From Swiss-Prot:
Domain named C-type lysozyme: residues: 1-129
Sequence similarity: Belongs to the glycosyl hydrolase 22 family.
Chain positions recorded as substrate binding sites: D101
Designated name of the protein: Lysozyme C
Active site per database record: E35, D52
Source organism: Gallus gallus (Chicken)
Length: 129
């Protein structure tokens, strides 16, 4: 599924991501824009042979099981495929764990480089929330 911007904002809010660990909803919509372009089915092989999965490009290195990332953990206790669902619940659950792991949204390198310190509220402008 390819969400609209305000649609994804509403889905993140319904799933309690809005101001989770102090990150405004525009921070999470911005991260999703640049990780996946709002595509739940997005997958990207990392050079290290791990894969990133879904709207928030959650990495098989630590967070989900794809069966092909030697020496990885599955700290969200989910198959990485669950992170490609048109329902974002499992992605939101796992992103709550990632953002609590100590480095906030810096865990998303695209957030750090493209959203951090920017006017992220623009990502939820005009959204009926
Ligand atoms: Na893994």
């Amino acid at each position: 599924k390819v969400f609209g911007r305000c649609e994804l904002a509403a889905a993140m809010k319904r799933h309690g991501l809005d101001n989770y660990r102090g990150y405004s909803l525009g921070n999470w919509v911005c991260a999703a824009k640049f990780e996946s372009n709002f595509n739940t089915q997005a997958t990207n092989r990392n050079t290290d042979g791990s894969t990133d999965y879904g709207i928030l490009q959650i990495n098989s290195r630590w967070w989900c099981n794809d069966g092909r990332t030697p020496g990885s953990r599955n700290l969200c206790n989910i198959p990485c495929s669950a992170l490609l669902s048109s329902d974002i619940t499992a992605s939101v659950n796992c992103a709550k764990k990632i953002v609590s792991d100590g480095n906030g949204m810096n865990a998303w390198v695209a957030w750090r480089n493209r959203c951090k310190g920017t006017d992220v509220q623009a990502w939820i402008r005009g959204c009926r929330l």
